[model samples]
Target: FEVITRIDLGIRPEIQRGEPVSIERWSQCMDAEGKVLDPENVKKLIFRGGLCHAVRKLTWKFLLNYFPWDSSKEDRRLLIKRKTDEYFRMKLQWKSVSEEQEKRNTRLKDYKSLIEKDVNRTDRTNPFYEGHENPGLILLHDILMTYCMYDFDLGYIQGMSDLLSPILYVMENEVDAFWCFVAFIEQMHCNFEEQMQGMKTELSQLSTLLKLLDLGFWNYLESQESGYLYFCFRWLLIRFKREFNFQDTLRLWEVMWTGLPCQNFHLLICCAILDSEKQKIMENHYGFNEILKHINELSLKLDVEEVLCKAEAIYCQMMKCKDLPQAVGEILGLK
Candidate 1:
C-alpha cells in the first residue's frame, strides 16, 4: 500500500528526441528538498530539439501547471479584469452575431466559437486556420488529433482542452504546443477507451490504493458522507487540473510520469494530500457538499512539498508489508 517512488506516466518528450531540452520543468520541487531531476549530467542538459518548435511552449505549461492562486489583492484584481474582459468581449461578440442570440448560445457554443469561426474564414491569414500559422499549436493539434484518431473509442473528450493549456502555454507557439500536447494525449489514450474501461480500472485502483494507504482517511471519508470520493474522479482522470494550480498540477503529473519505483505515485500523492487535510475535514465534520467545497478550495493554499514528503514516508511504510492486497498491487502494476 505504501511505496515511495512512483511510476512516471512515461511521457518523456525530451528523451524521445535524444536532445536535452530545458530542465526548468524538471527542477521543480516535488518534495521539500528539490526537483527529482539529477542536476549533474542531465541538469542543464540540452536534448536534440523536438521536430516541432512547440517544444519551447512547455515552459509556461509547466509553470502555470503547478503554481496555485494566491487570494491576494493583486490576484483579486487580476481575476476581476479577467472576468470583466471576458464579459465585455462576449457582449460585443453577441452584438456582431448574425443569428438570433439565443441565451443558450452563450451557455452552449462557448468562447471558442469565435476562434472556431475565425478558423473557418481567415484562410491563410488566421494563424489557427492556416496549417503553417504556428508550428507549436499545429504539433499539439496533430498529436491530439492523432490520439483522437487512434482512440476512436473515446473520441475527443472535452477536458482534454484544459490538459493542453499548460502545454500550449509552455510551447508558446500554438503549433508546437499542439504537437507536444498530442504526445501527451497519447499516454492518456487508454483513458478514452470505447467503454471507458481503462478509466474505470484506474479510478477503481486509485480508490483502492487510497484506502489501503490510510483506512482511517477512508473511514473519515465514509463518515463524512463522501465514501466513494467520486468527486475526485475528474481530478485523477485529468491529473488534477481543476484542483491544483496549473503549474503545480503539472509538477505532480511530471513526477508521476517519471515512473519511479511505483506506478501509482500520483495515487499515493493524492492520498497524502487528502490525509494532510483530514484533520480539517474531520474538525469541520464536512458533509458531501462541504467536503466537495473543502477539497475544491485547497488550490494554492496547499504545501506541495510537505504533502509530498508525507506521501513518501507513507510509501516507505507501505513497502514494509510482505503481504499486500490485490487491489494495491494492481495499481502499482506489480501483478
Candidate 2:
C-alpha cells in the first residue's frame, strides 16, 4: 500500500500495500528511449493501468455528468457545501492562533501580496485579467459570481480568491474552470451560507473522522483543548494550497479523485501527514506557533510518491477492519 503524504499516525500499519510489482505496459508506456515493451512488463502495466484508468474515467464522468450544472435550487446548494468545507478547514487551521492579531495580519498580508501580484497584470492576457483568454479564472469568476448572486448575504469575501487559485490552475480552461468550480461549490455552498450551517457540519464531521482514526491523538488534542484542530481547517477547506507544495497538492487531489482504494483515503492521508510530525510538535512543546511552523514546513519536504505508498498501506488495513462506514464506502466505492 502507498500513502501519498508524509503525515504520520501514532501507529504505522505493518504492510506493503503499494501497487502490484508490475502493471501491463501499454503502447503509451514506452521507455524514454522508445524501446519495445517487454511482454511480461506490458501485461503487468495493463492490468493495473487498465483498472486505474477505468476507475478514474468513471469517477470523472460521474462527477461531471450527474452532479453537473443544474439551474435548480439543488444545484445552487453546491456553493454551500464548499463554504461548509471552508469553515472546517479554517477551524483546524486557525483555532490555535485565532487571537493572534499579528499572525492574522501576516497571513492576510501574504494573501494581499499574492492578489496584487496576480490582480492587474501588464499582460492583459494574464489569467486574472478581466478579458484574458483564461478559461480557469473565468470558471472561478462565474461560480463565484453565481455564488454572489445566489447568496447576497456573504457576497464575495477575500479568501474566496485563494480558494479559486488552485482550481483555476487545475482546469487551465476558463469554461471548464467555471463548471468545475460550480461542482466544487456544490460541496462548499455551506461556507457561504448566511448562517454558516455548512461550515458547522463539516467541522463536526472532520472532528469525527479524526477521532475515529486515532482516539489517542483526539484525546491529546482534547486534553490540550485543541480537539477542534481548527488550525488545519483552512488547509482542509482549500486543499492545503498554503500548506503543501503546488505540484504535490495537485497530484494528491487527482489521486483522491481517482477513487481508488477509498474516498476518506485523502482525509486519512491528511491525518497521517500531521501525525508523522507529532514528534517535533510534542518535543518542542509546540504552542500554536510551533505547530503551525512544523506543519507549514511540510511544504518544502513533501514526498508525494512516498506518501502515496504509505497511504495505500493504511487503506488496505482500514479495509480489512470489517466494513467501513457505509456512507464513506459508497462515496469511495470501497466495496
Candidate 3:
C-alpha cells in the first residue's frame, strides 16, 4: 500500500492530563448500596487514568462485563452464585476425565500439558507466581484447565496465561477469576481463533490509519516492506500483555475496556507508539529487522500514561484534520 501524502495538517490537539479517579469521585459514580450508578461516567473517569487498586478490583468486574452496571446488590449476589455454580459444573467435567479417556484424547492432554508449563513460567519471578508448589500456580493451572472445558473450541493458547494471571491476581477466587476471564476472552476470541483472521484485518486497518497519521513515516515503512505492521502482532494478539508491567497493564486495560475516545482505540495506541518512535526510526533509517528489534526492546521501557496521553491526542488530532480519509474516519467512528 502507498502512503497518503498530502497537505500538512495543522497543530495537533492539546489534551489536559487529569488526576486518577479518586475514591470520592468513584463513590459518586456508584450508589449508596455499592452498585455502579453511572457506568458511562465511570468509564470516562477510568479512561482519564489512575484508579486505586481496590477500586480497580471492584470496578474491573463491570469493565469486563462480569457484573452488569444496572444490576442491584441482591441481583448481583444471585448472579455471582449462579455463575459460581456454573463454573464448577464445567470444572467438574474436566476434573472427571479418566486416565483412559485422556490417553485417547491427545488434544486435551496436550492442552493440559501446555497449560501446566505456561502456568509454571508465567510471572514466576513475581511473588504472585513464584515459590515451590505455589497455590497461585495451582490456581492458575486449574483455571486454565477449566477454561478449556468452558470453551473447548478455543481450548488453550500460549499467551492466555498472561491474560489470566492479572485477572486471577485481582479476583483471587478461582470461580470469579474464571468467569471474568470468560468475559474478557469473549472480546479477544477472534485474536486467538485458529485462522487468526482477526489479527490480519487489524494489521491492515492499522496500516490504513498509519498512512493517514504520518505520511512520511508510513512511506518509510512501506519502502522497507514493513508497512503491514507485522512487528505489532505480539502487542495486539495479547493486548500488550508483555509490553507493560502488571500495574500498568491494569491501568491500560481499564482505559481500553472503556472503549472511550473512539472505537478500536487499541489500534490508536499502536499508532501512538509508532509516532513516538517515528523520528528515531527515520533518522537511523531502520529496516525490518532493526524495526522489530527496537519495538521488542521497548518491552519495559514504555510509560503507560505518556502513551495513553499521546493516543488520546492522536485521536483528537485525527478528528481535527479537515482532509482525513473516509476510510480512517469510518474505522474510528468519526464519520
List lDDT for all candidates, in order.
Answer: 0.52, 0.51, 0.86
How much is the lDDT of residue 190 in candidate 1? 76
lDDT computed for candidate 2: 0.51
By lDDT, the best candidate is: 3
Question: Candidate 3: where is the Cα deviation over 4 Å?
Answer: 1-3
Q: Output the TM-score of candidate 3.
A: 0.95
List runs of model 1 lying over 4 Å from the truth.
Answer: 1-153, 173-176, 193-195, 223-225
Q: lDDT score, residue 334, model 3? A: 93
- Put down candidate 1 lDDT per residue, 138-181, tens digits, no spaces: 44444444343333445456567557655655555433454456
TM-score per prediction, in order, is 0.56, 0.56, 0.95
* Window of ten residues with lowest summed lDDT in model 3: 1-10
Model 2 residue 115 lDDT score: 40
Q: Which has the better TM-score: candidate 2, or candidate 3?
A: 3
Q: For candidate 3, lDDT tens digit of each residue in 16-38? A: 76877777788788787767887
After the best TM-score superposition of candidate 2, give how far the Cα of residue 169 lies from its true spot, in angstroms.
Answer: 3.2
Q: Candidate 2, residues 232-296: lDDT per residue as tens digits?
A: 76766665555566555555555554445564555666666665776666566666655766776
